[PDB]
Amino acid sequence: PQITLWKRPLVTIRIGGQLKEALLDTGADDTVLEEMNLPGKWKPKMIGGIGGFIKVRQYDQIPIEICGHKAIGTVLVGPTPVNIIGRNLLTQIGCTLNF
Amino acid sequence: PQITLWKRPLVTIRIGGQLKEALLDTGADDTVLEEMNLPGKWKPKMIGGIGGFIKVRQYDQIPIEICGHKAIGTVLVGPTPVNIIGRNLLTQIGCTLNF
Ligand SMILES: CC[C@H](C)CN(C[C@@H](O)[C@H](Cc1ccccc1)NC(=O)O[C@H]1CO[C@H]2OCC[C@H]21)S(=O)(=O)c1ccc2c(c1)OCO2
């Protein structure tokens, strides 16, 4: 597909067995999802943005489907205001910026 | 160009006659640049990111050339971790996401 940027590039993703709306975010190195009680082992991490840092839980090798395209990789879970699909998964679903 | 996302999508911009490196950030509504001087009136504004809210200076109708493509629009100056080009200017240069 082609997604214009007149509005926030929000798409439907599936992780665990929840459907969520998430931003396709070229400015995000990593994928950061809103607080959810995901099973499995995790490691603590801090990530920084506008305003400062938040504490997140890093889970590895988590399958996520992004608009019907399969991906699997690291997801960070924490008190973000929005679900963010970062470059780690965007490359996996074949996503490019074009102008 | 077509820009893949295995690396951060950093580009050279020209603003106020100066060259800077900035991040094409589809997850950003607004364009936010690190502390710098720009001419003309600005107004105090606050914006929120992943880590909380910051104070910025809002400059309106500012020319910026992004990777050779002209935009003229709102630029926010403040304590962002990195220069970010957001959707207000990405739309002007005809940037879309494609997968
Ligand atoms: C360091 C470069 C960016 C500022 C990083 N941010 C991704 C942004 O796309 C972020 C994504 C975002 C979007 C909404 C809320 C919070 C975060 N947008 C953002 O802060 O935009 C602000 C400017 O425009 C405004 O519109 C949206 C918020 C404002 S981030 O969310 O803090 C972020 C995401 C994944 C990360 C990360 C930081 O560090 C490692 O992995």
**DSSP notation for A66-79:** ETTEEEEEEEEES-
Strand partners, A12: A21
Q: Per the structure block, which two tokens stand in for A65?
A: 């489907």
Taking a C-beta distance cutoff of 8 angstroms, is the pair A79, A54 a contact?
A: yes
Side-chain half-sphere of B20: how many Cα atoms within 13 Å?
20
Strands (E), chain A: 2-3, 10-15, 18-24, 32-33, 43-49, 52-66, 69-77, 83-85, 96-98
Elucidation technique: X-ray
Measured between alpha carbons, how far is A75 from B6 in angstroms, rounded to an integer? Answer: 17
The residue length of chain A stands at: 99
| Closest atom, ligand 1, to C-alpha of B30 | 24
Measured between alpha carbons, how far is A73 from A80 in angstroms, rounded to an integer? Answer: 19
Query: Which of A30, A50, A53, A89 to mutate for ligand 1's pocket (most ligand atoms within 8 Å of CB)?
Result: A50
In the 8-state DSSP scheme, what is residue A30?
Answer: S
In the chain, the amino acid numbered B71 is A
Q: Per the structure block, which two tokens stand in for A48?
A: 């920084």
Question: Is A32's Cβ below 8 Å from some Cβ in B?
Answer: yes
Strands (E), chain B: 2-3, 10-15, 18-24, 32-33, 43-49, 52-66, 69-77, 84-85, 96-98
The residue numbers preceding gaps of C to N over 2.5 A in chain B are none
For A84, the 3-state DSSP assignment is: strand
Measured between alpha carbons, how far is A30 from A33 in angstroms, rounded to an integer? Answer: 10
Measured between alpha carbons, how far is A8 from A65 in angstroms, rounded to an integer? Answer: 19
Taking a C-beta distance cutoff of 8 angstroms, is the pair A13, A69 a contact?
A: no
> How many angstroms is the resolution?
1.9
Domain ranges of chain B: 1-99
In the chain, the amino acid numbered B54 is I
| CATH no. for A1-99 | 2.40.70.10
Measured between alpha carbons, how far is B24 from B93 in angstroms, rounded to an integer? Answer: 11
Measured between alpha carbons, how far is B64 from A31 in angstroms, rounded to an integer? Answer: 29
Alpha carbon of A96: minimum distance to chain B alpha carbons (Å): 5
Measured at the CA of A93, the angle between CA A89 and CA A97, to 5 degrees, comes to 90
Q: Which among A48, A51, A87 has CB closest to B48?
A: A51
**Phi, psi (deg, nearest 5) at residue B20:** -140, 160
